[PDB]
Design a protein around this ligand. Structure first.
Ligand SMILES: Nc1ncnc2c1ncn2[C@@H]1O[C@H](COP(=O)(O)OP(=O)(O)O)[C@@H](O)[C@H]1O
Ligand SMILES: Nc1ncnc2c1ncn2[C@@H]1O[C@H](COP(=O)(O)OP(=O)(O)O)[C@@H](O)[C@H]1O
Ligand SMILES: Nc1ncnc2c1ncn2[C@@H]1O[C@H](COP(=O)(O)OP(=O)(O)O)[C@@H](O)[C@H]1O
Ligand SMILES: [Mg+2]
Ligand SMILES: [Mg+2]
Ligand SMILES: [Mg+2]
Ligand SMILES: [Mg+2]
Ligand SMILES: [Mg+2]
Ligand SMILES: [Mg+2]
Ligand SMILES: [Mg+2]
Ligand SMILES: [Mg+2]
Ligand SMILES: [Mg+2]
Ligand SMILES: [Mg+2]
Ligand SMILES: [Mg+2]
Ligand SMILES: [Mg+2]
Ligand SMILES: [Mg+2]
Ligand SMILES: [Mg+2]
Ligand SMILES: [Mg+2]
Ligand SMILES: [Mg+2]
Ligand SMILES: [Mg+2]
Lengths: 375, 375, 375
């Protein structure tokens, strides 16, 4: 065990399951969210004997299993494979058990009543846990980023948050989520890059969909004004060779997939987009922090990593805004771990320990104990 | 055409615009206020050819469009969609044109100078009209209810009025609006029912927001004493099955939404709510009708529909009050259309015709014609 | 601490609480009169830990709080929040204590019995005071102006007086207050500007009420003959920009808000107003000082700041006058602070020191010590 003060620190997210201890900058435990039921008698029998695969190794051998994930766009839909994922989150990758030792969780800026009582409950159930606390991603992100006032653009394998937060305090009312960040994005990219040609199909040709997007993506300066030249000329569409090898032009997906993060009308939605929200939660925030809110625009996480978005954030927020107000967008592309950083860095501290629930106050009160506790 | 007098009647409101002729009860013209610009080339092209949908069919087909409305919280924010709305509200569903025929409008009890001058103009511009006028909602809503004297609480898709009327006359100086009734209501419900679980999100899961609150909501007798038993038991938060069909426990919103109409310290403001206003407007008024105004509290609009709301009324006007004075609580829940109702009935008469603005007396003195005119 | 004679000076008003020591000009202490219970669990919980805000950092940070004021039109209406106001006023902003040191107060020209006997008990209760006094605003403002014989016109956040003071002496009979200066003013402006347009609504859009009147208000030369060409032309009503940035037009409010001062029929009242008050108290006074009263009209307060008001006095006081007796309106717009100026400068003096109430003679007399004592 480490010297740094005893907590487990587990960031629930939608792409990769991040967990670790107190003190760090990059994740101790990384794994995607999967547990796969194998299925065959005949050839599974014929060839194998052992197993079911989880996360890491399940990236490797997989064409023998049944690959579903168990969490989606937020609160866990079935927490059943989440349980054995958390079993895996504790008992070999870190290796330490939450049985003796204190434990933290992250959460969205504000969580609900009922399932977040049952969140508290599940820790005490299967995992036993003598002390747990649960702290906000946005607030901890901004403390990772070192700051006192900053409106944190979060955006993961699923959700985008836009929290106004002033000297540590997020604001009670200015609340909106975009549920665009990861899947709809990537798997409409699967939809289209497949119609463009080759069945990314069954046993061989599937998770190239998940290599490709990340490498190809700059967010362009404007759309159909490039898509005109694009088609007469031949530049931004690059002929790339994959583990099979036929001439693959990937070309819009680059700017297209994240132009959807701006405006979902490019798949086809009548509803909103990121640009509006960013401003709109500030326009329904507080008048004398509105000021500093536009003037402290910051970002966190996965889908934010993309090159071209400072150029977009300086472009289109100002494109709604008055003549009188002013935006300041702030840059740092370290940001792909900063929630797990914020959790890890805050875990270590003297101050934070007294704020723990002790399991004695669970048994006394119930899981509703969480509703008078975590700040 | 009807036998009953040549006079069109529009009741505008922020939610569903109501209009018709002279004499009726329930509305002749109903629609919700959308036109929304169609957007795609490619898949709009491939599949269709026609359209762009006003109102009616834009609650049938819509996941192609760009769904925005234009009447928000009172005075018209952009009237360009209102113009083509009014081009629907006249030309196809009622069908009968303003060109030869007299026309009437509804409005709040007292209106300003210029954004009512141009309304008088804009009716004579696009729609030409050889005669027109506009009535207050308050009083027509009261003569509808059958009464000479009455403090009516309005509450519809955005606003609440708490309007003191005695013998046909409202009182010249006690004037407060509560800008809550429809949206911050349903859409704060959107916010926290979404955090309770399922991104209600893109093409398929959205307008259950506006189906669910209507059925589920009642006004309860007290709040965090009921939120106590709540979290121990499993009573008042039922499970129901929607167009998809996962277990949706819908729970507080029922009683939490309408409590926010009363005390808006339940999203979290800082800052008023109706219980006060319903009294405040009367404490500010003539001492010899303070009397009867507390003795003649009445109600109108759709957000008024709720079960338990009289129970909330009788409780918490009285609970401010001195030992001396006395509240009556007058019941009528017919009152969902009372504002369109009386404009229909009043359009029928003899008396009201002489009042009409004639196109000639407009052209003479300008759009201020209404300043000296509208009783 | 300063060299100048040990004495605290609270010029209590019903807008911004002000204070300081002796010898000065502009305020040493200024804070708006707000403390205010924050409310929530859940999101308040989630997003902070400490606090409830007084005045200053309330005038910052406020959308989390429960904001009411405790002094209204004149004498305080519950002395509970006024208490923790004075607790702030002494112990952090001046920092000093009324524990060791002598303490002065401000008041209107003469005051009543009971609650001012009690204004001799609260400062000796919690705040202890070994030596105290209270003096008259009107009179102090006139020696602040460096003069002997004046009728001063006050007008602050709520209230207005019309006081003869001749060679130091106010006349014991000539007396009428006006209760229009601050709130009814600004918050009928909120009411009418609200009817004109956009809800000054809930979290973001509410104190642009207070800000807009001050800058925009001139008194004008006459009302409805200006409101004629107002509608026909487009002159006085300016299109600015606020933190929102829609084309807000402010227009009458300028002249109508100070019109309603002189003539409160521009919301709607049956009783009086100012010009006659300013004439009548001198009509009801000694015959041979009438002369010098009408010939020494002088003003102070915040609300007396509006441009045009000089030309208004010189018009509508003299409009009531006979041919024989003559007015002389005196101009100084130094006058936003003049009563506290009155107290601070007068607190220095050797003369005034023998006038103090020692806490010893309070303990002997009880509350009735100020009755014989104060001049
Ligand atoms: N460099 C990058 N470029 C493009 N997309 C990225 C990059 N890094 C991460 N992402 C995207 O971010 C998502 C994962 O972000 P993350 O914040 O880790 O989600 P979570 O916390 O919810 O697990 C993935 O869908 C991934 O494609
Ligand atoms: N049965 C009902 N229960 C609760 N709310 C209702 C009911 N019927 C209508 N409403 C509400 O009434 C509001 C609209 O009322 P209405 O007075 O017609 O508004 P408007 O005149 O401004 O169009 C809506 O926001 C709707 O949810
Ligand atoms: N520049 C100004 N123009 C007009 N009104 C003003 C100005 N400055 C302050 N006021 C008004 O003066 C009032 C407060 O005056 P003040 O004498 O300080 O009141 P108080 O002594 O009772 O605190 C408020 O209604 C405020 O809007
Ligand atoms: Mg995350
Ligand atoms: Mg564009
Ligand atoms: Mg769109
Ligand atoms: Mg708004
Ligand atoms: Mg503010
Ligand atoms: Mg503790
Ligand atoms: Mg209505
Ligand atoms: Mg209550
Ligand atoms: Mg409140
Ligand atoms: Mg009052
Ligand atoms: Mg009376
Ligand atoms: Mg006529
Ligand atoms: Mg004063
Ligand atoms: Mg006049
Ligand atoms: Mg009058
Ligand atoms: Mg005499
Ligand atoms: Mg003495």
């Amino acid at each position: 065990d480490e010297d740094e003060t005893t907590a487990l620190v587990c960031d629930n997210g939608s792409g990769l399951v991040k967990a670790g201890f107190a003190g760090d900058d990059a994740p101790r435990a990384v794994f995607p969210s999967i547990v796969g039921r194998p299925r065959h008698q005949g050839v599974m029998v014929g060839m194998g004997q052992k197993d079911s695969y989880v996360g890491d190794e399940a990236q490797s051998k997989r064409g023998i299993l049944t690959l579903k994930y168990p969490i989606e766009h937020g609160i866990i839909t079935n927490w059943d494979d989440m349980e054995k994922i958390w079993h895996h989150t504790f008992y070999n990758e870190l290796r330490v058990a939450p049985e003796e030792h204190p434990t933290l969780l992250t959460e969205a800026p504000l969580n609900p009543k009922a399932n977040r009582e049952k969140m508290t409950q599940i820790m005490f159930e299967t995992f036993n846990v003598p002390a747990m606390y649960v702290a906000i991603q946005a607030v901890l992100s901004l403390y990772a980023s070192g700051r006192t006032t900053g409106i944190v653009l979060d955006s993961g394998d699923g959700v985008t948050h836009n929290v106004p937060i002033y000297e540590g305090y997020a604001l009670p009312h200015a609340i909106m989520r975009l549920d665009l960040a990861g899947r709809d994005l990537t798997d409409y990219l699967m939809k289209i890059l497949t119609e463009r040609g080759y069945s990314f199909v069954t046993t061989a040709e599937r998770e190239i969909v998940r290599d490709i997007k990340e490498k190809l993506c700059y967010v362009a300066l404007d759309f159909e004004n490039e898509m005109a030249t694009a088609a007469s000329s031949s530049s931004l569409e690059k002929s790339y060779e994959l583990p099979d090898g036929q001439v693959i032009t990937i070309g819009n997906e680059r700017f297209r997939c994240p132009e959807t993060l701006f405006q979902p009308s490019f798949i086809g939605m009548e509803s909103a987009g990121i640009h509006e929200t960013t401003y709109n939660s500030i326009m329904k925030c507080d008048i004398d922090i509105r000021k500093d809110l536009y003037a402290n625009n910051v970002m966190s996480g996965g889908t934010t990593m993309y090159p071209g978005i400072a150029d977009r954030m300086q472009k289109e927020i100002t494109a709604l805004a008055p003549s009188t107000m002013k935006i300041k967008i702030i840059a740092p592309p370290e940001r792909k771990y900063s929630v797990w950083i914020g959790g890890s860095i805050l875990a270590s501290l003297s101050t934070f320990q007294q704020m723990w629930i002790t399991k004695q106050e669970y048994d006394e009160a119930g899981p509703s104990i969480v509703h008078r506790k975590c700040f």
